[PDB]
Amino acid sequence: SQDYCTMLYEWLTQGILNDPYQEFMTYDDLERAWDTQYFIRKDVLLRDCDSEEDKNLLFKMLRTGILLKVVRASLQIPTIPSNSSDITIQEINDFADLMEGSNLELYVDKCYSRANEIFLKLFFQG
Amino acid sequence: MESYYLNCIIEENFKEMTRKLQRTENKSQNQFDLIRLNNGTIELNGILTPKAEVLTKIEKTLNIDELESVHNTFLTNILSHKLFATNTSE
């Protein structure tokens, strides 16, 4: 899962989804781009998504992606510069332990914090 | 009848054609590229741009096809009016 991790990290830090094989967790419309409705393909998710916590994780994922996406759409830039904020994130260099737990959510909500701070700064100052 | 023809069929269409062809000429007299409709609908297209914000340390004119397109729209919408049509099912 090298480039799979690349895809997931790239989406969590740029909201860009590039799945020419349609394997990623969620997928866009255009099967104008304003009601950017998103759908869950539950058949590929790592968890049963039945209890509250994995639903929480998935929904934070979706929100973070959408937030960064709208940031890019508004500012007319396809890429988010690294140095826009203080919270710096890394790639999933050891997916093995990340999959186990006790770090998955830590990564998820650190990215969530990044998304919230930049997004709120967007609609509060810009 | 003549007045109606020249003041409710032709002129209104010509005014719309010049309005669309002219909107590209001006500079922002209002920073909201706004559209006023026949039903009172008000819609803002384009991106709500940031207010020149310094976060970290060009407008839409028409090509040739749009020109031919808009002139043809003007003409045909004149001749699709109920006071000219002769030979359709409509």
Phi then psi dihedrals of residue A63, to 5 deg: -60, -45
**To 5 degrees, how large is the angle CA A32–CA A35–CA A38?**
125
A66 and A12 Cβ atoms separated by less than 8 Å: no
Residues on chain A touching B51 (C-beta within 8 angstroms): 126
Residues on chain B touching A86 (C-beta within 8 angstroms): none
Strand ranges, E, within A26-126: 26-27, 39-40
A109 and A64 Cβ atoms separated by less than 8 Å: no
* Helix (H), strand (E) at residue A119: helix A104-124
A26 and A41 Cβ atoms separated by less than 8 Å: yes
How far apart (Å, rounded) are the C-alpha atoms in residues A69 and A26? 14
Residues on chain B touching A122 (C-beta within 8 angstroms): 55
The identity of residue B11, as a single letter, is E
Residue B64's Cβ-count burial label (10 Å; 0-12, 13-18, 19+) is exposed
Whether B50 sits inside 8 A of A74 (CB atoms) is yes
Quoted resolution (Å): 3.7
Residue A115's Cβ-count burial label (10 Å; 0-12, 13-18, 19+) is buried
Task: Supply the Cα-derived Rg of chain A in whole angstroms.
Answer: 15
How far apart (Å, rounded) are the C-alpha atoms in residues A103 and A96? 11
A77 in B contact zone (CB under 8 Å): no
